[PDB]
Amino acid sequence: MDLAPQMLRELQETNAALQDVRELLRQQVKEITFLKNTVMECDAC
Amino acid sequence: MDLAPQMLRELQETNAALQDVRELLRQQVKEITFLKNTVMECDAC
Amino acid sequence: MDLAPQMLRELQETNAALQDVRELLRQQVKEITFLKNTVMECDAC
Amino acid sequence: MDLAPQMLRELQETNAALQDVRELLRQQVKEITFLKNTVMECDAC
Amino acid sequence: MDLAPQMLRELQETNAALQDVRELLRQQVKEITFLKNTVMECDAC
Ligand SMILES: CCCCCCCCCCCCCC(=O)O
């Protein structure tokens, strides 16, 4: 129906891109939390 | 009418992921801030 | 019934969450820049 | 009532917010990269 | 005035910027990971 089909595909791609960003961020948070504890447990500090 | 139901669904899933990203970012800045504070008080520095 | 009003609401909710994300990120960069400068002045280094 | 005009405005606001998010992420990655290298050449390591 | 064409262009712009955000995030996670590992093999601690 006109551009509706095209718009729906764009929305689907956005949702897919979002899922990946979500996974990346969840991975980044773990690394950051790890870094935090590591420096937090540094003897020289 | 039209692909309205389909489009709405994609928007709903996107918002669900976006709300998750916001909370993830919320937690991350908190960890980063604690990491910053720890380094600021690091005697080695 | 008509789903247009509901679609508009979803879009409005997206922008609200996206705005919070922009604000958090803005703060995070500031925190990361502070962390960087602190490390640059860390004597042990 | 045609909600297309209002929907368009929301989509436009979304892109404006995304542009700010991308610009912020660009500067953030630069700060983190600089932090990485600074720790790499840190004497006490 | 039909706004569908313009709305489609907005959706495409959203996916373009999001892909940029994703590319930057995956690079950043790599930089953060490098930072994490460098701190782990840092003698000072
Ligand atoms: C309608 C599309 C939804 C908007 C997409 C949201 C993009 C947010 C990316 C978050 C960036 C994370 C930055 C960070 O803390 O490292």
Residue numbers in the entry:
A (entry chain D), B (entry chain E), C (entry chain A), D (entry chain B), E (entry chain C): 27 to 71
Publication excerpt:
The COMPcc chain fragment forms a parallel left-handed coiled-coil with an average length of 70 Å and an average outer diameter of about 30 Å. The axial pore of the pentamer is divided by the hydrophilic Gln54 ring system into two hydrophobic cavities that are exclusively lined with aliphatic side chains.
The longitudinal axis of the fatty acids are parallel to the five-fold channel symmetry. Because myristic acid has 14 carbon atoms, the contribution of the hydrophobic effect (this is equivalent to removing seven or eight pairs of carbon atoms) to the binding of myristic acid to COMPcc can be roughly estimated to be between 2.1 kcal/mol and 2.4 kcal/mol. This indicates that the hydrophobic effect contributes about a fourth of the interaction energy of the fatty acid binding.
